[PDB]
Design a binder for this molecule. Structure first.
Ligand SMILES: [Mn+2]
Ligand SMILES: [Mn+2]
Ligand SMILES: [Mn+2]
Ligand SMILES: [Mn+2]
Ligand SMILES: [N+]
Ligand SMILES: [N+]
Ligand SMILES: [Zn+2]
Ligand SMILES: [Zn+2]
Lengths: 368, 180, 368, 180
DNA sequence: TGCGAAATTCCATGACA
DNA sequence: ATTGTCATGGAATTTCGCA
DNA sequence: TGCGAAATTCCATGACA
DNA sequence: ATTGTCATGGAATTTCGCA
């Protein structure tokens, strides 16, 4: 403050203040003649308050804050002080957007067998059809083979009724879903344990995580739409038609229909493939086992030029889920306890609870 | 001749009437000929309409080339004939009053009777588990269960315990008591 | 049909059917032994129906359709026939997504003078504040200088009341807005003509077109949010504070505040720039005129690797604006009358009306 | 000494009472000293509160270093003093009862009177156009209008016609009739 | 051991949430 | 305590039919 | 006529619709 | 009959302070 600025006025050298400019008193303040003009050098003790007044005018970031200050002031390493405040502005931290993208997506392995994993989800509400408003969509992870059930609500009870009908055929090892009320209820938990089924949940608000079923929803709606062109939206009677139609459609990249991947032979449906007519069932199944292992698997794409990947003990912020109007889009900062994989983390949320969370719902807190 | 395959032939039949379970009285039985895989559907009657309603569910998953049945009224109606024709399913009838399938239908009748006793009215709920049992039951002729043959894989519900399937002492007496 | 297939069975050459494979009769049909297996060759007269039955199973595109057919059939140039049908499937054409991106955005010139152009828009509804729910945002094109007015509705009448207050200061040449009810009403048209103001409209559902104000909305909400952290959302009293705060904030890329760009001198606000203290007003204004011409101008970015640009007489489809559930996302095909610029077109919509339309709300109809 | 600039000094004053126009009686007059640019605000009273309410609008656009006024009650109140202090505006008073600004205030009084006749009650609506006129009016001393000086550009509403500003024969007689 | 055309594969784009 | 996906239709690349 | 650090500029990212 | 925009904060690049 007044200590540092004293030695300066007489003309001795202090670290940070370049010796080649002339520093003087005038109007009761220490000044300095810089190329841009004459600026006041405030005492170290005044600087925090200044940076703060500047930043608070419009809660501006680094440069826009600095340009306000530089209008009247100069001191050594001004931006360092600006950045210090930005890092401590609760309001900027929870309101500003990020400008670093997530790391590149994972392409988890395809389940090895049919019934290893189901992805499940609800579509709707849809226009009423015979008093029904939702569709339960169950997608086998390995085959893509999909079951459709109309329901009146996305409820646990309607979920159980449908899955009892489906699990008549086979019981899956795992069933993966989002954290919706219907799948997280204890009633559903019991129903699963009762059967040796493990429940897997997607991180919250990240449907990419159950992308298989989300994606299948797209085909389901797309085909319903086409079949409903210029007629009233009576979808109930078409569920069975759509289910069959999709289960027997080729994926160009795989060169197989989900039906084939499930049974290794077409049923009596139009254009049934006949290639294995002369093989015994047992020979057929052996060629199926081979087909299942050799399916195309996508690889993780290149990182975008400005991504971040989570590091343990990093300060990060979770996105507010359903933020009210004129309220911040981000939660207060929190700490990365564990890096489950490069795209998934456990955070201690300052309450503090352990939350498992996608990096897509995260930003790295700015200014360290 | 080409080898036998799944979906080549479905064998359907009704079982009932049974005691009322949640409004249902009968069971449509569908057994795939090659695999011995069984599907069961509760109906309220052995009618053409109940058959079409149930088969619509099944034929949403897989369509047989041929359906085989006895000459039950539900199966010989021309409604049912029209239904099959619409789906390119050829219909096939055993002559009136006259292998692997036959045994399966025995297993089903018997396994029902077993569990139907003590709870003659709760069978609707048991259909799923009955099927799972039937379908993960080892076939002495083939080295495989119907599940294995259908899907080419082991199942997550193996029924390692082959059961009595026979009626114990307590049950014979309370089956002779229920039917009084 | 039976003509072409006849010469073939005897073993003579027809264009399209390779001479090196053996073609024969069996079961009443012409067959052929191809590497993949034995396929039926249908008569030319049967082929359209086949392609159609195949395509209709799940309304599948090129490959997924072809793979169904190839299960039973072979004929010359099968895909050509598949593509012919896809091009005539009304339902596929209006339901499928595009897979070609728009051409690269234009960066129109900055208005040369303050008051040359205003961009205007409404924000809201917002939580009630003193009975107010909307904000009228008026942004000067050249300066960024922005006026804020709270309103009860996004109505013409409230628009006129506000613009009368603002145009007390100066009258603009042009006022640009979206095609909202409030700006397209005849009452507003009259109010503008009455004053020598030209009305400019954005193409429909393309706010990028008035991006200046849309973007300013973001800062307006962002700053209101920060100032409202942990207090009840009483925004009415803050409009004047926000307006001032923003008008006097630096754009890092320009190195100027909109206020400076408008007046060439700061008013009595915190951290007022003093660089022109010694110049006469007239010298100041002369340096302002120079500053205004030399502002940074962004350039049009690179095209994405698979973009399309509109060509006159091309078949294209306009996106349905507020499509109902399970209804197509695209209108029927239509023709490009005029290419206004590479990102804007006039289409005859088959009704047929002339509509001016952004290419972002367009897809090029598939399969010619 | 440094040259005169816009926002160096605002000159404010009230005009009124006037005939009721849409509930308003007075006009706060703000003239920027250097440029001669005029802002007008309708008020219901020449009170400190009406002054702060109106100046809040203006000071949302630009803030003067100094405000100059006569010793009107609205301007000498300590509420108004507190208001100015809050914004770093220094207050400046002409001594009781005692250039470019003076002429502008004349123009305003006169131009109002002109248009106020025939429609003494519709003045509220006319304020915008009155300002535009005043501000695109050529200054004989400087080569420029206040608009030009404020913004450094020509305006899209030049008032090429300098007007009588004087009261015609029909108006003198109906001003002598209205005020009866 | 090479050419023109057809077939197949590649892959950006967008939509499910 | 967990993780994107895949139909689509022009373009790019490979294969086929023929010498 | 070159070094280390500070200042400035670059620019991807995302959010307004 | 018309058209994206720009605050943001790490990284990249340039400039400064000094010999
Ligand atoms: Mn029978
Ligand atoms: Mn006075
Ligand atoms: Mn979903
Ligand atoms: Mn908007
Ligand atoms: N994995
Ligand atoms: N332009
Ligand atoms: Zn802040
Ligand atoms: Zn189609």
């Amino acid at each position: 403050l007044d200590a540092e600025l004293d030695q300066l006025l007489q003309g001795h050298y202090i670290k940070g203040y370049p010796k080649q400019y002339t520093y003087f008193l005038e109007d009761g303040k220490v000044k300095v003649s810089r190329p841009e003009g004459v600026k006041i050098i405030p005492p170290q003790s005044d600087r925090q308050k200044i940076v703060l007044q500047a930043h608070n005018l419009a809660h501006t970031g680094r440069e826009a804050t600095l340009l306000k200050i530089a209008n009247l002031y100069w001191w050594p390493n001004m931006r360092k002080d600006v950045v210090k405040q930005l890092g401590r502005c609760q309001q900027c931290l929870i309101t500003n957007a990020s400008n670093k993208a997530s790391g590149p997506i994972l392409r988890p392995d395809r389940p090895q067998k049919p019934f290893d994993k189901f992805f499940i989800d609800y579509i709707g509400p849809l226009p009423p059809s015979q008093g029904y408003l939702y569709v339960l969509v169950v997608v086998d992870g390995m085959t893509g083979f999909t079951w459709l059930y109309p329901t009146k609500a996305p409820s646990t009870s309607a979920t159980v009724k449908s899955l009892n009908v489906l699990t008549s055929i086979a019981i899956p090892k795992v069933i993966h879903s989002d954290q919706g009320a219907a799948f997280t209820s204890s009633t559903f938990a019991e129903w699963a344990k009762e059967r040796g089924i493990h429940l897997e949940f997607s991180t919250p608000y990240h449907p990419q995580s159950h992308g298989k079923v989300e994606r299948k929803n797209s085909d389901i709606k797309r085909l319903l739409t086409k079949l409903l062109v210029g007629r009233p939206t009576k979808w109930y009677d078409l569920l069975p038609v759509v289910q069959l139609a999709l289960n027997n459609t080729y994926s160009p990249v795989l060169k197989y229909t989900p039906h084939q991947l499930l049974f290794g032979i077409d049923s009596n449906t139009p254009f049934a493939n006949q290639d294995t007519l002369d093989l015994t069932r047992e020979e057929e199944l052996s060629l199926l086992q081979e087909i299942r292992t050799s399916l195309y698997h996508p690889s993780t794409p290149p990182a975008s030029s400005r991504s971040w990947s989570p590091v343990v003990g990093q300060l990060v912020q979770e996105r507010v889920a359903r933020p009210a109007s004129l309220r911040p889009r981000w939660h207060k900062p929190s700490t990365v306890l564990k890096v489950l994989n490069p795209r998934t983390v456990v955070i201690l949320d300052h309450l503090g609870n352990n939350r498992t969370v996608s990096i897509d719902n995260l930003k790295p807190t700015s200014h360290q | 001749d080409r080898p036998q395959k799944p979906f080549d032939k479905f064998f359907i039949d009704y079982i009932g009437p049974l005691p009322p379970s949640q409004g249902y009285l009968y069971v449509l039985v569908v057994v795939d000929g090659m695999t011995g895989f069984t599907w069961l559907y509760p109906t309220k009657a052995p009618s053409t309409s109940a058959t079409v309603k149930s088969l619509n569910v099944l034929t949403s998953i897989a369509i047989p080339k041929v359906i085989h049945s006895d000459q039950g009224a539900a199966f010989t109606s021309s409604t049912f004939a029209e239904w099959a024709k619409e789906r390119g399913i050829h219909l096939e009838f055993s002559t009136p009053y006259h292998g692997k399938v036959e045994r399966k239908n025995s297993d089903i009748k018997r396994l029902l009777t077993k569990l139907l006793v003590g709870r003659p009215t709760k069978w609707y709920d048991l259909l799923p588990v009955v099927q799972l049992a039937l379908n993960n039951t080892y076939s002495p002729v083939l080295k495989y269960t119907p599940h294995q043959l259908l899907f080419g894989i082991d199942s997550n519900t193996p029924f390692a315990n082959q059961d009595t399937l026979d009626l114990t002492r307590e049950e014979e007496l309370s089956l002779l008591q229920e039917i009084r």
